[PDB]
Amino acid sequence: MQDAITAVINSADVQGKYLDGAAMDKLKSYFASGELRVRAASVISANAATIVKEAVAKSLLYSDVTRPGGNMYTTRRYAACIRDLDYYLRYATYAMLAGDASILDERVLNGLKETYNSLGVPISSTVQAIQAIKEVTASLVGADAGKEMGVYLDYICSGLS
Amino acid sequence: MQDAITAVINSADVQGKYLDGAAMDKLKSYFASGELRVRAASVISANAATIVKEAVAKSLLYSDVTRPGGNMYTTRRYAACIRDLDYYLRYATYAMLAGDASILDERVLNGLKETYNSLGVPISSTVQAIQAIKEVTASLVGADAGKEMGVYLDYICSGLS
Amino acid sequence: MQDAITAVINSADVQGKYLDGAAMDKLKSYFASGELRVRAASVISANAATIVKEAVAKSLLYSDVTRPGGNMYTTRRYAACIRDLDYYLRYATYAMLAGDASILDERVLNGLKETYNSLGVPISSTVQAIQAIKEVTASLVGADAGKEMGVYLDYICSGLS
Amino acid sequence: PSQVAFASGDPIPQNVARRTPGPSLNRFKEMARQVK
Amino acid sequence: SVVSQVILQADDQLRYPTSGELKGIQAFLTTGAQRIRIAETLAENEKKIVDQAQKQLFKKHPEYRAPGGNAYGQRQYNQCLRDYGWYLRLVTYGVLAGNKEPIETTGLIGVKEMYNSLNVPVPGMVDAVTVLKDAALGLLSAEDANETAPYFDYIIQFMS
Amino acid sequence: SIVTKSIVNADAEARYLSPGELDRIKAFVTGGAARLRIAETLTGSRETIVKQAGDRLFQKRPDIVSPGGNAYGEEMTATCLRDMDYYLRLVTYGVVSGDVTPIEEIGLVGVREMYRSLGTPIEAVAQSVREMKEVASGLMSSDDAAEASAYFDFVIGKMS
Amino acid sequence: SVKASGGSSLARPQLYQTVPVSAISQAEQQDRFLEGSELNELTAYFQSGALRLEIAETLTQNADLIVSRAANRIFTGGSPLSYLEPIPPGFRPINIARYGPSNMQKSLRDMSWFLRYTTYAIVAGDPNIIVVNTRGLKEVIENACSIDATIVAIQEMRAASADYFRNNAQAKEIVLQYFDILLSEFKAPTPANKVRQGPSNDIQGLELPQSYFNAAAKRQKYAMKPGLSALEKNAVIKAAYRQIFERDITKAYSQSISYLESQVRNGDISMKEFVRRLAKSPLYRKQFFEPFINSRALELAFRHILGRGPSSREEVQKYFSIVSSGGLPALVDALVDSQEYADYFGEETVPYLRGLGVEAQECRNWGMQQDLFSYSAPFRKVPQFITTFAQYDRPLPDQHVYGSGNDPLEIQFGAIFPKETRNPSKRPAPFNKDTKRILIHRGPAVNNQVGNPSAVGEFPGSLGAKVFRLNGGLPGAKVGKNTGTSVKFGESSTQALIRAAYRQVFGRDLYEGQRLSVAEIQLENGDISVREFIKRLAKSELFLKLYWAPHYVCKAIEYMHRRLLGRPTYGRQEMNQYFDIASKQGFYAVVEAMIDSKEYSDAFGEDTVPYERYLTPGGLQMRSARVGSLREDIGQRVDKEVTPRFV
Amino acid sequence: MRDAVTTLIKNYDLTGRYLDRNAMDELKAYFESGSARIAAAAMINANSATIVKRAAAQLFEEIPELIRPSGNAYTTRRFSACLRDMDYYLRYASYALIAADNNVLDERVLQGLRETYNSLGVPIGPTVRGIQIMKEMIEAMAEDSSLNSTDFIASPFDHMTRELSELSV
Ligand SMILES: *[C@@H](C)[C@H]1/C(=C/c2[nH]c(/C=C3N=C(/C=C4\NC(=O)C(CC)=C4C)C(C)=C\3CCC(=O)O)c(CCC(=O)O)c2C)NC(=O)[C@@H]1C
Ligand SMILES: *[C@@H](C)[C@H]1/C(=C/c2[nH]c(/C=C3N=C(/C=C4\NC(=O)C(CC)=C4C)C(C)=C\3CCC(=O)O)c(CCC(=O)O)c2C)NC(=O)[C@@H]1C
Ligand SMILES: *[C@H](C)[C@H]1/C(=C/c2[nH]c(/C=C3N=C(/C=C4\NC(=O)C(CC)=C4C)C(C)=C\3CCC(=O)O)c(CCC(=O)O)c2C)NC(=O)[C@@H]1C
Ligand SMILES: *[C@H](C)[C@H]1/C(=C/c2[nH]c(/C=C3N=C(/C=C4\NC(=O)C(CC)=C4C)C(C)=C\3CCC(=O)O)c(CCC(=O)O)c2C)NC(=O)[C@@H]1C
Ligand SMILES: *[C@H](C)[C@H]1/C(=C/c2[nH]c(/C=C3N=C(/C=C4\NC(=O)C(CC)=C4C)C(C)=C\3CCC(=O)O)c(CCC(=O)O)c2C)NC(=O)[C@@H]1C
Ligand SMILES: *[C@H](C)[C@H]1/C(=C/c2[nH]c(/C=C3N=C(/C=C4\NC(=O)C(CC)=C4C)C(C)=C\3CCC(=O)O)c(CCC(=O)O)c2C)NC(=O)[C@@H]1C
Ligand SMILES: *[C@H](C)[C@H]1/C(=C/c2[nH]c(/C=C3N=C(/C=C4\NC(=O)C(CC)=C4C)C(C)=C\3CCC(=O)O)c(CCC(=O)O)c2C)NC(=O)[C@@H]1C
Ligand SMILES: *[C@H](C)[C@H]1/C(=C/c2[nH]c(/C=C3N=C(/C=C4\NC(=O)C(CC)=C4C)C(C)=C\3CCC(=O)O)c(CCC(=O)O)c2C)NC(=O)[C@@H]1C
Ligand SMILES: *[C@H](C)[C@H]1/C(=C/c2[nH]c(/C=C3N=C(/C=C4\NC(=O)C(CC)=C4C)C(C)=C\3CCC(=O)O)c(CCC(=O)O)c2C)NC(=O)[C@@H]1C
């Protein structure tokens, strides 16, 4: 994975030049937003199971999926769906703390669309479930850090499609 | 893998007949070459570290590949290509003493294209590097044994291209 | 493991003779009291979580061991003792079902006695816990099967001591 | 020194025979013997 | 025993025996009266079974008694009837316990390389069990035979 | 299924089906008619069992029905009765199969993770099935009740 | 038929071991150049090989004489050679007529084939070809052939080959010992089969005969014993690094944990404990956990520790639940503290890759494990196991008949196909001939030709793509606007049609020196119709260069069908048709066939420019499952937001 | 692995239906035939080795090229592997007989059979022929034996023929 610090180092490393003032401003922006990122991560970590709880209730519950014939009928499937949204929330916080969507394109999305197609998991529904996470996360933490969380949750939605 | 001897016997077993004439001719040409093929291998084995040294110097060194942006820039990537050209030298040695490129088929070209395209290794730069080995080995061991190595080293070159 | 049915078989196997009427009378006893063992196993299986709690509260809870300074104070060690007693009851059910205390000699008292001396687990407190298990299981199932159950729980008590 | 040339030199041609009808068509071989 | 097989399967998943597993025990414990009856009719009537089994084997296979055989000596010939007596002993143990496990551990697990290191043919002993089976079930009653039949058939399976 | 369990055990060793397994399938086949009798009484009285044991749950544990509880409201009470209807249906699958494998795979694996996410006390769902056991037992004969209870008691153990 | 395919990569079983094969593979597995030992193996063999040629040459020529003298001694009552294709234990000579012709034909050819395999054994220089093919032969031949007659037949051939050759004691002893091995292996009864017992209920049990694991090159097994000299101890540790990291990383990058190396060299922690600590180390974590998805890292962890791929769907489901609970350490702990690991490797033995030759293989995860044992496995980042296992139970997936790679991305321009080599994501599925793919219509759902074939030439009314038609009169059609009329209004409409006709054949608008000006003005004059104009743009050398030539043949056919008809192919029936034309006639005729097709004529007239009519479900998902464009009522429960009653 | 009971459960569980009259009748049909299914399984357990060997001997007389050079049953190594395969198909049909379902036949046999046989060079034509010879060997022996129902015996072997073999038409 790459964080915002490593990303601007690697961009300078590939060119084979020292970090200039324009590249240094990218770091200073991260060191300014770093306090906002750490505080946001602490809130989501505390309400990790709680954010999912509201998100499933808003989007997934009392729909087609949970009813017999759907992809969330059996208790094993339902628990796996909670597990999947527990995955998505945990990795979105990792990417938020890093300040780069490198971990998502490495451990989350790179070979997820193929699995979801094969298992018969509806992508259109799970995207809406992550959008349900996005709304809960932004309401709990704030508008400033929820927008930051929003980008990386949208990144998962884009990779799934 | 299969060597030259077993390939002759397999072809005799498929037809279901004794080693008559044409099968014997390929065997006697193999056994006569064997003594010098061992001698060539022993020289290559001993000079394995030095052969690569000259080969990288001729092809890879002082180029855009070693320069930042290239695939042989970082030290980890440098040592990987050193190991790779050590693999190419060893498996050409294996195929020389087997008298068949079946070892190159199942152990080298099983997914050499699969690894190199995924990582983003330049094919042309690798071909030039193995071509550099071919010229070094021909100068070190001999023109006769260098051509004997040449057919297997070009097999990898054609196997990449 | 060596069941009570296979106990007379293995004894006859070592002797290299057929099962006599003085050996099959014990087998006839197992076939008669077998239906009692199954019902006893069914009651314990259903109430597996409750037997433990009623034993821990009787002996272990509100004591020096559960209070600071003891070996059953920390939650980590508390969960260990709960896990232990869960395994203690389950394997005692197996010995009750099989009719022989060989599984207690093999899959319980193999190196359990020496691990407890290594960690500094009180032997007297563990014996008291198994004795507490004995009184609960006898009250739940009955006096007919509980006395039979008490033999195998005595084997653990004599094994630890 | 030029004895080393096995795969670098002239390749030895191998005799591969044409595949012939086998004892599965022994019925038809019997029929072909009577079709004269 | 089938009792052991259930508690092995339960311990493997780290759980108590299930509803269908406990009923499988219940079914065996009731039919145990028949299981006892198998033992007496084979143990006491061993001498008739063993003699019929050996005379049918050496007739069908006149090789071991023939020159360049396996059991030419009288001490060697007693050892063939010793094996016959041991196998029917193993049959009784298997039926009484209810499963193949008593026969498995004692006289099936690594039984091929046993007779390979003694020059006794395993394809020769697979025909030995069949004639022992045929002799045994013939003496047994109709409903009793069908119970004892698949225990013999498993020995045949593991041999060849 | 029992047939499922017997084959899988036989296949893992690769030895065909043992006589011990074949006897247990025979016990399952013979007891299949009794299994269909218990299942028919459970599927026949599905409306009554859920209603009686549901009412028993709301009287014994009023806290879930009380405001602040999980099953408070007309919709939430209906969902609880739907849940009880699901588990009774799972029982009928279990009774039919002989074992508790269909109950496990469909509606016992990850129930603790499910009801934690919903905010449902797992001990209260343990009560509902235990009350479903008592109502169903008081509709069929003693031998039928003891057979059916073994499936119910497995659910209790997985709940609490 | 099966609904999923794991792949059918080429399997190369070693039928028999030779001296060069035994020598080369010995250092290949150790990842070393052939040292003074393995060179001397070849040196002695190449010198003796010249003599070994003289052994066979005599035996191949006099093969007829050896089998004649054998058969005459064994078989009595006539001549056995009528229909040619020292120590007697107690054999009886078999009658020719009594044995029967069919049994005699078997008997004669085997006697020749025994000698034939002896000649191959000397030439190979290793009696492996004998040991394999003779060990479990006594039992199968016993049924309808006497053993006593066979032993004396080989013993006759032993004497026959001895007297005919008889050159030197350094030469004849090679003939003697190989025949001595032959009779001893034939005297030996069939050994017990290698039983691969299933580790749990989920995995099936297997069996392999004691002949298949006698030739297929035994995997070198290293065990850490505390007393060993440090050179072979280094060889054990290097092999342990070669297992866990797929390669010797301590040689490559000097990446080594000496802290763990010291404890195993002493014997503080076992090899089981070493593998445990090495697979939870940051060195493994960075390389085989960090770059991969949780499912794929699990699949890699299987081959590193257990030395095999996941066998069953239930196994992947179980072990994924572990890696979700506690992560990498918990996964490693579950893999090392398994009933399988301690059965195969125990405590001392280094894990080894158990493939085709090592043990019995199951017909479930064949191609999935074949690609996994390859060194190109940690580049396939798409899971192969959980994908195939789930697809096995499910029906046929939304996929092209020739694989997932044959499907282009549903974009405006550019033929973009998933590469087989770059990031292996090949998903084979057994598609048969009469398999129609379900396609989503761009326009109304009722206007699909599968259910409504009459509504094939119905235009999508603000649901799909814009239809371009030469409805308006072309400029200079009639001699009404005589000479002048500089502002002829019907001129911009036909030019916009041309641009759209260019945009359909080639997704993007072309450059200045790419536009076919001759074809444009013929359409504008009214010499050719749109149907002919589309055909000419697809018959252009530029279309050949840009879409046909750089792409796979069937990829190029598929993309052409998606451009000219605006529809993916239904299945095999259509794809095979155009592929047959591509083989015989060429590219230009494939263009011709797609335009002159009835379905083209029904959908688009002589004046109608083609358009995107049907999408693949995967293509529409890329369009309408993103953050935007996605509706609220696709796969979400919609609650009616009403103002509360207290408000 | 799924039997006829589990398949019927999964079918009704999917829709979320209680076991109706049609469900109970299908189970009752299984339980009545079950006694014949175990008795058929007892027959093939008795004659496991004899059928496999005789069916192979019939196959290599039908297609002689298998045991001839260039054939994939030529060598002892190949002959032992083929008889092992013939032993596998009979063993998994043995499981399929009691189960009365071809899920066990699909999951553990047929799923990755085509991929394997195409890899080593094992023929797929003589294979399904050898399975069909075994079928005829069981059915004739079951006709000889005192068995009331013998129709269910054809089911697993025909499914083995249908799935594995190439689609001709
Ligand atoms: C003083 C430093 C010593 C010295 C150096 C020396 N180095 C080379 C050759 C190379 N050195 C590197 C190393 C790096 N390049 C990278 O990208 C990185 C990572 C950031 C490093 C550390 C490489 C790859 C080369 C190859 C040059 C090329 O671009 O092709 C040489 C030349 C060797 C030769 O004979 O060709 C020399 C002389 N020389 C000494 O003796 C000093 C102790
Ligand atoms: C000079 C050769 C060029 C070059 C090479 C290069 N290779 C890698 C990485 C790998 N090389 C292999 C290949 C093999 N390993 C094997 O086991 C075998 C068969 C015996 C071969 C041929 C593999 C699998 C890897 C990846 C694993 C590893 O790290 O060792 C790299 C590094 C790429 C990266 O960024 O990870 C490089 C640079 N590249 C060049 O620039 C030369 C033209
Ligand atoms: C919940 C939002 C929706 C849903 C999820 C669902 N997932 C599974 C099972 C799996 N989940 C994954 C996916 C991942 N593997 C990874 O590596 C990552 C990234 C870290 C993830 C998230 C995989 C591979 C599995 C298979 C493992 C298993 O069998 O459990 C299921 C279960 C489906 C089944 O039983 O086959 C479900 C239901 N699907 C829905 O219905 C929700 C809308
Ligand atoms: C109050 C917040 C809630 C509550 C408390 C409650 N706890 C118990 C039982 C015990 N609590 C512990 C646990 C600990 N001991 C430790 O060392 C630690 C970690 C530092 C803890 C938290 C123990 C060991 C007991 C057993 C009692 C004993 O002293 O032996 C009870 C009693 C349960 C009973 O009925 O027996 C209670 C009431 N329960 C609530 O309802 C509150 C929400
Ligand atoms: C009644 C015994 C108790 C109770 C019930 C209750 N459950 C829910 C929510 C759900 N229940 C389930 C569970 C299942 N559905 C299935 O298909 C299966 C497998 C057979 C089970 C076990 C699900 C999925 C839901 C969600 C509803 C949906 O279908 O989408 C609720 C509602 C919780 C809420 O507020 O959202 C309730 C009340 N709760 C109690 O208090 C009783 C002890
Ligand atoms: C310019 C900012 C950078 C750049 C561009 C570049 N693009 C191509 C070729 C293609 N562009 C696309 C992408 C699209 N397809 C779509 O549907 C859309 C949205 C409407 C877009 C933008 C495609 C499909 C291609 C492939 C060929 C084609 O034109 O159809 C190239 C050429 C690549 C080649 O090797 O052929 C380039 C260079 N690259 C840079 O260097 C800029 C930073
Ligand atoms: C009705 C039971 C439920 C339902 C249906 C529904 N379907 C669509 C759209 C399509 N349906 C299909 C499927 C098929 N076409 C085929 O060729 C076959 C195989 C014979 C089938 C079954 C397709 C391809 C489409 C896409 C449009 C088209 O016709 O090409 C919709 C509309 C979806 C949309 O948003 O456009 C609907 C509503 N959905 C329900 O609510 C019912 C439970
Ligand atoms: C008896 C006096 C002689 C005899 C008769 C016989 N042979 C067969 C057929 C087979 N022969 C073999 C043996 C081999 N396989 C190998 O790999 C080699 C080379 C080392 C040999 C010689 C095998 C496997 C068969 C079976 C395949 C086939 O049908 O051809 C038979 C038929 C067996 C039957 O009854 O089914 C008979 C009767 N073979 C001898 O060894 C004697 C010389
Ligand atoms: C005999 C009927 C035919 C035949 C058989 C044959 N098969 C192989 C190779 C393999 N067989 C399998 C297949 C299976 N293993 C399973 O788990 C199952 C499902 C129960 C089957 C059917 C496998 C995995 C292999 C390869 C490894 C192994 O032997 O275990 C061979 C060997 C080919 C070779 O020469 O290497 C043979 C001979 N061949 C015929 O010609 C007959 C028609």
Curated annotation (Swiss-Prot), chains A, B, C:
**Which Pfam family, giving just one, matches this sequence?**
Phycobilisome
Name where it mostly resides: membrane
Q: Keywords in UniProt for this one?
A: Antenna complex, Bile pigment, Chromophore, Electron transport, Membrane, Methylation, Photosynthesis, Phycobilisome, Thylakoid, Transport
Any one of the GO BP annotations: photosynthesis
Report the locations given in the UniProt record.
Answer: Cellular thylakoid membrane
Modification(s) after translation: Contains one covalently linked phycocyanobilin chromophore.
Name it: Allophycocyanin beta chain
Native source organism of the sequence = Synechocystis sp. (strain ATCC 27184 / PCC 6803 / Kazusa)
From Swiss-Prot, chain E:
User: How this protein is processed and modified after translation, per its record?
Assistant: Contains one covalently linked bilin chromophore.
Q: Does the keyword Electron transport apply?
A: yes
Which residues does this entry mark as bearing N4-methylasparagine?
Answer: 70
Sorted alphabetically, the Gene Ontology BP terms of this entry are: photosynthesis
Under SUPFAM superfamilies, the record lists: Globin-like
Q: Is this entry keyworded Membrane?
A: yes
In this chain, (2R,3E)-phycocyanobilin is annotated as bound at 80
Query: Membrane-spanning residues where?
Result: none
Q: How does it sit in the membrane?
A: Peripheral membrane protein
- Mention any Pfam family matching this sequence: Phycobilisome
Localization per Swiss-Prot or TrEMBL: Cellular thylakoid membrane
Q: Mind naming one GO cellular-component term on file for this protein?
A: plasma membrane-derived thylakoid membrane
Binding partners and assembly: Heterohexamer of two alpha chains, one alpha-B chain and three beta chains.
The family classification in the record reads:
Belongs to the phycobiliprotein family.
Reported function = Light-harvesting photosynthetic bile pigment-protein from the phycobiliprotein complex. Allophycocyanin has a maximum absorption at approximately 654 nanometers.
Name this protein carries in UniProt:
Allophycocyanin subunit alpha-B
Q: Which organism is it from?
A: Synechocystis sp. (strain ATCC 27184 / PCC 6803 / Kazusa)
Q: Which gene encodes it?
A: apcD
UniProtKB/Swiss-Prot annotation, chain F:
- InterPro entries linked: Globin-like_sf, Phycobilisome_asu/bsu, Phycobilisome_asu/bsu_sf
One GO cellular-component annotation of the UniProt record comes to:
plasma membrane-derived thylakoid membrane
- Purpose: Light-harvesting photosynthetic bile pigment-protein from the phycobiliprotein complex. Allophycocyanin has a maximum absorption at approximately 650 nanometers.
The Gene Ontology biological process annotation of the record reads: photosynthesis
Quaternary form?
Answer: Heterodimer of an alpha and a beta chain.
Q: List locations, semicolon-separated.
A: Cellular thylakoid membrane
* Residues with the N4-methylasparagine modification: 70
| Membrane topology listed for this record | Peripheral membrane protein
Report the gene name. apcA
Entry PTM: Contains one covalently linked phycocyanobilin chromophore.
Question: Any idea what this protein is called?
Answer: Allophycocyanin alpha chain
Q: Which SUPFAM superfamilies match?
A: Globin-like
Q: Keywords for this entry? A: Antenna complex, Bile pigment, Chromophore, Electron transport, Membrane, Methylation, Photosynthesis, Phycobilisome, Thylakoid, Transport
Pfam families registered for this protein in UniProt: Phycobilisome
Question: Looking at the keywords, is Magnesium present?
Answer: no
Q: Could you say which protein family the record assigns here? A: Belongs to the phycobiliprotein family.
Its source organism is: Synechocystis sp. (strain ATCC 27184 / PCC 6803 / Kazusa)
Swiss-Prot record, chain G:
List GO terms (cellular component aspect).
phycobilisome; plasma membrane-derived thylakoid membrane
What is the recorded post-translational modification?
A: Contains one covalently linked bilin chromophore. This protein autochromophorylates.
Quote the EC number. Answer: 4.-.-.-
Q: Where does (2R,3E)-phycocyanobilin bind?
A: 145
Q: Which UniProt keywords apply?
A: Antenna complex, Bile pigment, Chromophore, Electron transport, Lyase, Membrane, Photosynthesis, Phycobilisome, Repeat, Thylakoid, Transport
Q: How does it sit in the membrane?
A: Peripheral membrane protein
Instruction: Write one Gene Ontology MF term.
Output: lyase activity
Function per UniProt:
This protein is postulated to act both as terminal energy acceptor (by its phycobilin-like domains) and as a linker polypeptide (by its repeats and arms) that stabilizes the phycobilisome core architecture. Has intrinsic bilin lyase activity.
This chain's protein is named Phycobiliprotein ApcE
Species in which this protein is naturally found: Synechocystis sp. (strain ATCC 27184 / PCC 6803 / Kazusa)
Q: Which residues of the full protein are shown?
A: 2 to 692 of 896
